[PDB]
Structures are given as structure tokens and as C-alpha cells.
A paper describes a structure:
Peroxisome-proliferator-activated receptor gamma (PPARG or PPARγ) is a ligand-activated nuclear receptor and master regulator of adipogenesis. Here we disclose the discovery of a series of chloro-nitro-arene covalent inverse-agonists of PPARγ that exploit a benzoxazole core to improve interactions with corepressors NCOR1 and NCOR2. The extended benzoxazole core brought a lipophilic arene in close contact with the lipophilic surface of the corepressor NCOR2, while the binding of the chloro-nitroarene warhead sequestered Helix-12, an essential binding surface for the coactivator MED1, deep inside the protein. Interestingly, agonists led to decreased signals in the inverse-agonist biochemical assay with NCOR2 peptide, and inverse-agonists conversely decreased the signal in the agonist assay with the MED1 peptide. This indicates that inverse-agonists may induce a structural conformation that disrupts basal interactions between PPARγ and coactivators, further shifting the equilibrium from activation to repression.
Numbering used by the authors:
A (entry chain C): 2347 to 2359
B (entry chain A): 202 to 259, 276 to 457, 463 to 477
Write the structure that this text describes.
């Protein structure tokens, strides 16, 4: 769900 | 097989990926293996093999899971950083980048968990503890069934005797899977995976003269890894039972 997604988006930027 | 521009470009990719792996992952397989064979004076782990050694050494399930999932965040960041170094990855649609990592990280975590395991047990507290396999298996249901399939995977995986050079290409192959649910543009992902697969195949022929079907056996292991990830969902159901707080804390460092 969106937790992991968010950490990944943060990480990608 | 010949030495040519093609093969040289593939050896150059392998090197590029090995270097980015080394920058991205502080705990390598070489370092893990060194700890497990007692080379590192620095880290001589306490062995937890039974309830008594557990005491000397210092839903319950859902709480464990909440724990390990949040502790995975460092690994997720390292793998994400590693992915940025794969040629073509940052040129993919952002949503696909995210989808590839969302599915892939679990597989990579289990892959790198194998590095911390032998037949006897697994390193915990970043190199400082060693939890035995049979102790974990001894615990009351459902906890006793949590780690045993990862040890089964890890023993079979570690018997392939991959090194970090090998693992860096393997992990990249995993990240670039064109079959993940919800991908938008499958083709550019497959294009990258094709290139990484070629690099892996060459790497394995050069690095592993003992086993001429290692390439296939290693691809089959992606099936195994996918199964372990998928089994976590089925364990949520088996679960729907008290456990020593110190065992709870240890489980929060596994996956
Ligand atoms: C943490 C700590 C201990 C155990 N254990 O002993 O089995 C397990 C965990 C844990 O939560 N592991 C875990 C396994 C597999 C997972 O797959 C996901 C996941 C999340 C989001 C998207 C996908 C596709 C998969 N998370 C997992 C967590």
C-alpha cells in the first residue's frame, strides 16, 4: 500500500 | 562465444552494476560470510540457541510485521538508489519505476537475507547476534513456521555460491520484471531486462565454470522468491499465542 509507495517516491526524487 | 564489442559492453555493464552495488549496499555478501566464518574480530556475534541464551543475550504477529516493514525502509532506500544506477531505469515512466520497486524490494530483501544465513541460523542486530534455525523452528505456532521456508530457500540459494559480482546483476534482473501487476509500458522494461539477462549469462559462464546450467537455476530462483513473498499473504490468514518480548524484538529484524 501507500506507505511503501511514498517511501519509494521520496527515495526516487 | 567470442570476445567482441558486444561482450565488452556486457562486461562494462556488469562492472558498472558491481560498483553501484558496492556504493548502495553497506552489508555485502562477502562481509556477511566473513562474520559467519569468524574472521571479523570487530563482530563476533552472540549465539541465541535456546531460551536461556536468549535471556543472557540482553496481535503479536501484526505488531512484528508492522515492525519489520518499517525497519525495511533503509533496505528499500538502498535498493531504490541501486535502481537509479541501472541504465534506462530513470527514463521509464515514474509510476512504473515505483511499481517495479514496490514488488521487487521484497524479493531483493529475501535475496540479501540469504547472505546472512547458513544451515545453523541467521545474523541479527546488524552482525551482533546469531539466531539459530532450530530455535526459531521450536517456537509456538504460528511463529515457529515464519522463518523456516526462508532457510530452505537460503540453503538452496547459497549452494549456488554466487558472489557480489553475480548478485548485482541478478538483483537488477529482478527489478526489471515486465510481468509486475499494473505496469503501463512493458516493452522498455523488457528491453532493459534483455540486456541485463545477457550480462548475467556472460557473467555466470566466466565466473562459474563448475556449473553450466547455473543461469537457468538462478532464474528458477526468481520463482522461489516470488513464492516466499506471496506466502506472506497466506500467513496473514493462518494467523486469523503469547511470545517473549525479546523474541518479538528479534523477529522485527527479519522478514
Ligand atoms: C517482518 C518480520 C518477520 C517476518 N517473518 O518472520 O515471516 C515477516 C515480516 C514481514 O512483514 N515480511 C514481509 C514479507 C513479504 C512481504 O510482501 C510485502 C509486500 C508489500 C507491498 C507490496 C508487495 C507486493 C508486497 N510486504 C512484505 C513483508
Amino acid at each position: 500500500n501507500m506507505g511503501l509507495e511514498a517511501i519509494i517516491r521520496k527515495a526516487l526524487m | 562465444m567470442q570476445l567482441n564489442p558486444e561482450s565488452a559492453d556486457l562486461r562494462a555493464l556488469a562492472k558498472h552494476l558491481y560498483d553501484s552495488y558496492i556504493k548502495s549496499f553497506p552489508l555485502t555478501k562477502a562481509k556477511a560470510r566473513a562474520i559467519l566464518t569468524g574472521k571479523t574480530t570487530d563482530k563476533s556475534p552472540f549465539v541465541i540457541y535456546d531460551m536461556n541464551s536468549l535471556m543472557m543475550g540482553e496481535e503479536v504477529a501484526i505488531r512484528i510485521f508492522q515492525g519489520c516493514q518499517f525497519r525495511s525502509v533503509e533496505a528499500v532506500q538502498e535498493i531504490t538508489e541501486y535502481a537509479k544506477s541501472i541504465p534506462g531505469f530513470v527514463n521509464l515512466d515514474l509510476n512504473d519505476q515505483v511499481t517495479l520497486l514496490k514488488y521487487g524490494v521484497h524479493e531483493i530483501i529475501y535475496t540479501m537475507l540469504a547472505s546472512l544465513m547458513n544451515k545453523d541460523g541467521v545474523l541479527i542486530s546488524e552482525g551482533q547476534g546469531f539466531m539459530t534455525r532450530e530455535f526459531l523452528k521450536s517456537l509456538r505456532k504460528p511463529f515457529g513456521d515464519f522463518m523456516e521456508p526462508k532457510f530452505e530457500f537460503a540453503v538452496k540459494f547459497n549452494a549456488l555460491e554466487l558472489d557480489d559480482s553475480d548478485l548485482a546483476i541478478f538483483i537488477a534482473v529482478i527489478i526489471l520484471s515486465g510481468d509486475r501487476p499494473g505496469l503501463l509500458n512493458v516493452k522498455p522494461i523488457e528491453d532493459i531486462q534483455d540486456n541485463l539477462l545477457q550480462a548475467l549469462e556472460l557473467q555466470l559462464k566466466l565466473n562459474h565454470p563448475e556449473s553450466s546450467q547455473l543461469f537457468a537455476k538462478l532464474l528458477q530462483k526468481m520463482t522461489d522468491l516470488r513464492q516466499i513473498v506471496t506466502e506472506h499473504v497466506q500467513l496473514l490468514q493462518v494467523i486469523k499465542m503469547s511470545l517473549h518480548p525479546l523474541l518479538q524484538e528479534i523477529y522485527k529484524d527479519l522478514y
